[PDB]
């Protein structure tokens, strides 16, 4: 079956791992255990088709970032995640999107902007239109707000990337 290489990017503590393991294992990771290096693979069914998904979960907090360029070179689709409870994580994404375009050398790369922790509405410091308005600037890229905890739009992040790659 066909393989899809996805990379989950974003700053520390935004929920990259929580979204990933909720997607592959249906487990909610409550603890904050900073990632060093982790890759997951799971056979799924997207639009009546069985396919292999490779998901590289990156370290939001690392000292050496030389490998990021290589992860971007080999990935087919990218999920840029921020947390709606921390403004700096949202601000940090513009650099990641610019770096990806630079490495792929095209403005048309499968991508989805994800605002995680949407279940913490009372703690929101990044508005939804603020998030939607950033995605429109990035050539109208996909955008959604999720929650690894409540299971809101978790599967959607990954299926959408598979769908953009299929076009």
């Amino acid at each position: 079956m066909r393989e899809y290489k996805l990379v989950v990017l974003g700053s520390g503590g935004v929920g990259k791992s929580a979204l990933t393991v909720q997607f592959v294992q249906g487990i909610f990771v409550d603890e904050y255990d900073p990632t060093i290096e982790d890759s997951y693979r799971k056979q799924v069914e997207v639009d009546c088709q069985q396919c292999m998904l490779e998901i590289l979960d990156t370290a939001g907090t690392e000292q050496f970032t030389a490998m990021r360029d290589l992860y971007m070179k080999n990935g087919q689709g990218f999920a840029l995640v921020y947390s709606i409870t921390a403004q700096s994580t949202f601000n940090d994404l513009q650099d990641l999107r610019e770096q990806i375009l630079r490495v792929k050398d095209t403005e048309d790369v499968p991508m989805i902007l994800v605002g995680n922790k949407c279940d913490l509405e009372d703690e929101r410091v990044v508005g939804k239109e603020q998030g939607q308005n950033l995605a429109r600037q990035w050539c109208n890229c996909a955008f959604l707000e999720s929650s690894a905890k409540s299971k809101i739009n978790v599967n959607e992040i990954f299926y959408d990337l598979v769908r953009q790659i299929n076009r």
Partner: peptide, 28 residues
């Protein structure tokens, strides 16, 4: 297996089974 990989932290005292426990569990 299934072309996966992980880098785990080792806290003194952990057995090989203790340090890989979580990585194996989240992959079934």
């Amino acid at each position: 297996p299934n072309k996966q990989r992980t880098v785990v932290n080792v806290r003194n005292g952990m057995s090989l089974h203790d340090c890989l426990m979580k990585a194996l569990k989240v992959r079934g």
